[PDB]
């Protein structure tokens, strides 16, 4: 189940989440939505039975409407009059039976309910015997997430990418650091590959001593 649709949206705005259920048949199964707010627990949203009946959680009844038509394997949740409390990663949960609600999942799609406009990061270098450390400061972005890799995914040993800190300005900031031998500084190249998809930003930074 590849969850898709999520992104930045205004309050009172609306979005529809799609769900490519390639692996087993959509109509052959009972399907669901479960959300997880950043840093929080799990919260069941809605159910559509293989038969057709539908139920909802208190906080989403009327505002949300689950839908399904057996096209090219897809499930949908229609979200209207969106509040800030709806900010979460949304998951498709496949059942294994009628009453059988053992949940099976995919990867999830992030919905941020904010009136703010997208802002892409600025990428500054953290400049570098036994072990020397170096990194990238990925500052002032909105919304989440950013991914950082090193040497296009070739450098993974010693790499720490920190969770994002919400600043006082309300924009996010994170750092990605690597430990390397000191002797291999002025010979081997270190580039961090910063990706901020919500604003289609891609930055690549040489980290020189």
């Amino acid at each position: 189940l590849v969850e898709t649709g999520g992104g930045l949206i205004q309050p009172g705005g609306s979005l529809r989440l799609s769900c490519a259920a390639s692996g087993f048949t959509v109509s052959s199964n009972y399907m669901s939505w479960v959300r997880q707010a950043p840093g929080k627990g799990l919260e069941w949203v809605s159910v559509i039975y293989s038969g057709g009946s539908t139920y909802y959680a208190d906080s989403v009844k009327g505002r949300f409407t689950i839908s399904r038509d057996n096209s090219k394997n897809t499930l949908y949740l229609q979200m209207n009059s969106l509040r800030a409390e709806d900010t979460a990663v949304y998951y498709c949960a496949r059942y294994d039976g009628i009453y059988g609600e053992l949940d099976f999942w995919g990867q999830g799609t992030l919905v941020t309910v904010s009136s703010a406009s997208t802002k892409g990061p600025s990428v500054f270098p953290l400049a570098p015997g036994g072990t020397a450390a170096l990194g990238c400061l990925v500052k002032d972005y909105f919304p989440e997430p950013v991914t950082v890799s090193w040497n296009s995914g070739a450098l993974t040993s010693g790499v720490h990418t920190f969770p994002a800190v919400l600043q006082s300005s309300g924009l996010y900031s994170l750092s990605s650091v690597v430990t390397v031998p000191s002797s291999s500084l002025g010979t081997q190249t270190y580039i961090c590959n910063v990706n901020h998809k919500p604003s289609n930003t891609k930055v690549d930074k040489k980290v020189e001593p």
């Binding site: 627990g41 799990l42 139920y55 053992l102 720490h160 900031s173 650091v177």
Partner: protein
């Protein structure tokens, strides 16, 4: 609406040893027709969807190790993880599916326990191109330590700082079980250009005396 409460909230146990997590439901989930409890246990790793481990209360899902097992009946349940591997660091939830709305516990974090390890400390002054844009960020890296608790004090011209720093900790490493911390001091170019000595001071259980890393503005 059935309420699932989990106990405890936090947990850490050493490798190969035994971690156990509880779950209590406000109503029985034992359906008399089949006599199989309507309860499930999930494992959620960081940045991943929950993965079902145990259905009908005590039945291991296919492809799940022999080391996880669920026990109990009706209202009170238990997830037991014997021989806690490296790969078993995650959050665990209990969920009932007897009556929609399907409801979850708040989760229980399961940390790995290890011997104290001291942070290796590094300090980076602000990059030149950031100073162009009108701001200075002074980063301090605490690399690979244990336990997670650590005190970072910024000292500027040996004058302490309060309010103008934030931090974030990496999740428990799944190989060596350590943690890492990043601390960022945020100042305007104008306010950064005033002082000389920028020092990051680190207090941790694996350091006998505090460790400082400093730079003099310039150098």
């Amino acid at each position: 609406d059935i309420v699932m409460t989990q106990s405890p909230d936090s947990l850490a146990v050493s490798l190969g040893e035994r971690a156990t997590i509880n779950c209590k439901s406000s109503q029985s989930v034992l359906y008399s027709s089949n006599n199989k409890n309507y309860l499930a246990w999930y494992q959620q790793k960081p940045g991943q969807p929950p993965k079902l481990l145990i259905y009908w209360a005590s039945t291991r899902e296919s492809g799940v190790p022999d080391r996880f097992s669920g026990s109990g009946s009706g209202t009170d349940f238990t997830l037991t993880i014997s021989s806690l591997q490296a790969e078993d660091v995650a959050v665990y939830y209990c969920q009932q599916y007897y009556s929609t709305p399907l409801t979850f516990g708040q989760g229980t974090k399961v940390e790995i326990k290890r011997t104290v390890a001291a942070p290796s400390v590094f300090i980076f002054p602000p990059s030149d191109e950031q100073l162009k844009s009108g701001t200075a960020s002074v980063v301090c890296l605490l690399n690979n330590f244990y336990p997670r608790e650590a005190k970072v004090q910024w000292k500027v011209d040996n004058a302490l700082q309060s309010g103008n720093s934030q931090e974030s900790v990496t999740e428990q490493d799944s190989k060596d079980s350590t943690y890492s911390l990043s601390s960022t001091l945020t100042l305007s170019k104008a306010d950064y250009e005033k002082h000389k000595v920028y020092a990051c001071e680190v207090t941790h259980q694996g350091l006998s005396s505090p460790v400082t890393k400093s730079f003099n503005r310039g150098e």
